[PDB]
C-alpha cells in the first residue's frame, strides 16, 4: 500500500475562556479525523462514517469512559506543570501518540508532549527513555523512567497494538483511504510561471520546476497542499522568469506512483 498512519492528539487548557473546552482529543487516520472527545460533550464520537458504520456502540461507550479518565489525568498533569514553571494565566498541554505503516512494510512509532505548543518530553521507544527539554521536563522524566514497566508497555503498544489498530481502520475506510484521484495540472503566467494542481487524493504530492533539465532549488516558490473542501486537494509551485535569456522551463508533478511533465513552450 501507500504509507498510512494513526495518531491521537490531546489538548488541555488551564484557564479557558467561557464555553471553550478545557480538554479536547481527536484521532486521525492519515489526514482524516476519525474520532473526537471534549470536556463539554463528555462523549467519544465518530468523525468518519466508515468508523461509525464499523464500531458497535459498546466500543464508543468503553472509550468514552477511558477518555473521561484521561481528561482528569491531563488536568492533573497540566496543573503540576504550570505550578513548576511558576506560570500564571492560561497555558496549554498537548500529547500526540501514533504509528505509521510504511510502503515497504516497516513501521514507526512515536509519543511526545508539549507545553505551550513547544516540545516538552519525547519518548524514545528503542532506548526506552524520555528526552526532556528543560528542568521541569527533567523532573517528570525521572518520575516516568522510574516506572520501567510503563516504558515497556508503551513500546509494545506503539510497535504492536497501534499497528494492528491501524490495519483494522485502514480496512474499514479502504474505499476512502486507498483510492487515487490523479491531479489536474496546468501552467499559467502571472512575471512568473505558476504550476497548479487540483482535484487530487491522497494529499501527498511533489511539484517542482526544472530549468533546462536541471532542478532549480532556492529559486522555486512552493505553495502549501491545501484542502479544497470536497475531499481532494490542490497545490502550486511558481518560478520567476529571466527576461534576459531564453530557457526551457518545465513543471514536474509526482503523485501516487505517476510522474507528469508540462513543458512551457
Amino acid at each position, epitope marked *: 500500500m501507500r504509507t498510512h498512519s494513526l495518531r491521537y492528539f490531546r489538548l488541555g487548557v488551564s484557564d479557558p475562556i467561557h464555553g471553550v473546552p478545557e480538554f479536547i482529543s481527536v484521532g486521525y487516520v492519515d489526514s482524516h479525523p476519525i474520532t473526537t472527545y471534549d470536556s463539554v460533550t463528555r462523549q467519544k464520537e465518530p468523525r468518519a462514517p466508515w468508523m461509525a458504520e464499523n464500531l458497535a456502540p459498546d466500543h464508543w461507550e468503553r472509550y468514552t*469512559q477511558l477518555l473521561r*479518565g484521561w481528561q*482528569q489525568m491531563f488536568k492533573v498533569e497540566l496543573k503540576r506543570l504550570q505550578r513548576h514553571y511558576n506560570h500564571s494565566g492560561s497555558h496549554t498541554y498537548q500529547r500526540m501518540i501514533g504509528c505509521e505503516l510504511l510502503e515497504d512494510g516497516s513501521t514507526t512509532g512515536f509519543l511526545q508532549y508539549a507545553y505551550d505548543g513547544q516540545d516538552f518530553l519525547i519518548f524514545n521507544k528503542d532506548t526506552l527513555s524520555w528526552l526532556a527539554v528543560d528542568n521541569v521536563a527533567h523532573t517528570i522524566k525521572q518520575a516516568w523512567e522510574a516506572n520501567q*514497566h510503563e516504558l515497556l*508497555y508503551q*513500546k*509494545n503498544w506503539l510497535e504492536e497494538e497501534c499497528i*494492528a489498530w491501524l490495519k483494522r481502520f485502514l480496512e474499514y475506510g479502504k474505499d476512502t483511504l486507498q483510492r487515487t484521484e490523479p491531479p489536474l495540472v496546468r501552467v499559467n503566467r502571472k512575471t512568473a510561471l505558476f504550476c497548479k494542481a487540483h482535484g487530487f487524493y491522497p494529499p501527498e504530492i511533489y511539484m517542482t520546476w526544472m530549468k533546462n533539465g536541471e532542478e532549480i532549488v532556492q529559486e522555486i516558490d512552493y505553495g502549501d497542499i491545501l484542502p479544497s473542501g470536497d475531499g481532494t486537494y490542490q497545490a502550486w509551485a511558481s518560478i520567476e522568469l529571466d527576461p534576459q535569456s531564453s530557457n526551457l522551463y518545465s513543471c514536474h508533478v509526482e503523485h501516487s506512483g505517476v510522474h507528469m511533465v508540462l513543458q512551457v513552450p
Partner: antibody, heavy 108, light 116 residues
Framework: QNIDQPTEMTATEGAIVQINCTYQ??????LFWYQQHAGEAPTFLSY??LDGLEEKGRFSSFLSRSKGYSYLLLKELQMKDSASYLC??????????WGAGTKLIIKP | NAGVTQTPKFQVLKTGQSMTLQCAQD?????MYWYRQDPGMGLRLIYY???????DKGEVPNGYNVSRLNKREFSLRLESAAPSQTSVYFC??????????????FGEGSRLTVLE
C-alpha cells in the same frame, strides 16, 4: 477470548514449581500474576509485556507474546507459598481477562 | 494509609432483600472496580469507575448498581438479592485505568450468601 491455567499443582517444600498461563486474545497490553491466600485479597506479583524473563526474589515471570504463554516460576518453595495464583491479561481495549487461578499445594 | 477498606466481611441475605457493600480507598487512586469471585472461574467485573464522576457496566452488571460517591468511595448495591448472587465480592482500585502497566489493589472481600 480465553485464558487458561491448571486448576491445581502440588510440589514439595524446597523444590521449584512453574505455573503456566496461556491466553488467546485479539490484542495484548500485558500479563499480570497475582497471589491470593485462602480467604484473603489478591496481591500483585508481576507484570510482563515484552518477551522474556523477569526476576523478583524467589519468583520470576516469563512471557512469550508469539506463543501467548507465560509462566510464574517459584524457587525454593516454602509452606507460606501455598496459595492460589491468578493470571490476568489486559486485552486490546485495556480490559482484564482473568484466568480461573491455580491452587498451589506444598508438601512439607 | 489503610489501602482499600470494604465492608461487611460477611452477610447472609434472604431472596429479595437489599444490600449495599461499602468500599473506600485512601491511596488517592482515580479508578475503582467491583468484582465477584466464584469457584471454577476467573474474577468477573460487575461495574467500574474510570474516574471520579463516571461509572459504567462491567461483564456482569445485571442485579447490581453502583455509586461513585466521591474520589474515595465506590458502593455496590444489590437491590433484590438472588441466590445466584451468592459469591465473594471484591472492591479494587488503581491509580488510573487504561494505562497499561498499573496493578490493582484489592479489598479484603465480602462473602454474601443469599437464601430462599
Amino acid at each position: 477470548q480465553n485464558i487458561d491455567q491448571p486448576t491445581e499443582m502440588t510440589a514439595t517444600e524446597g523444590a521449584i514449581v512453574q505455573i503456566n498461563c496461556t491466553y488467546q486474545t485479539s490484542g495484548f497490553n500485558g500479563l499480570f500474576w497475582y497471589q491470593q491466600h485462602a480467604g484473603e485479597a489478591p496481591t500483585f506479583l508481576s507484570y510482563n509485556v515484552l518477551d522474556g524473563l523477569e526476576e523478583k526474589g524467589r519468583f520470576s515471570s516469563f512471557l512469550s507474546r508469539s506463543k501467548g504463554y507465560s509462566y510464574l516460576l517459584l524457587k525454593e518453595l516454602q509452606m507460606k507459598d501455598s496459595a492460589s495464583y491468578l493470571c490476568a491479561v489486559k486485552d486490546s481495549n485495556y480490559q482484564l481477562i482473568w484466568g480461573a487461578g491455580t491452587k498451589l499445594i506444598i508438601k512439607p | 494509609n489503610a489501602g482499600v477498606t470494604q465492608t461487611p466481611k460477611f452477610q447472609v441475605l434472604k431472596t429479595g432483600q437489599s444490600m449495599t457493600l461499602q468500599c473506600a480507598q485512601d491511596m488517592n487512586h482515580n479508578s475503582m472496580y467491583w468484582y465477584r469471585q466464584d469457584p471454577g472461574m476467573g474474577l468477573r467485573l460487575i461495574y467500574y469507575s474510570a474516574s471520579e464522576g463516571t461509572t459504567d457496566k462491567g461483564e456482569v452488571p445485571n442485579g447490581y448498581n453502583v455509586s461513585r460517591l466521591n474520589k474515595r468511595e465506590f458502593s455496590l448495591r444489590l437491590e433484590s438479592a438472588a441466590p445466584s448472587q451468592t459469591s465473594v465480592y471484591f472492591c479494587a482500585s488503581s491509580v488510573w485505568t487504561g494505562e497499561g502497566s498499573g496493578e490493582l489493589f484489592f479489598g479484603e472481600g465480602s462473602r454474601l450468601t443469599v437464601l430462599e
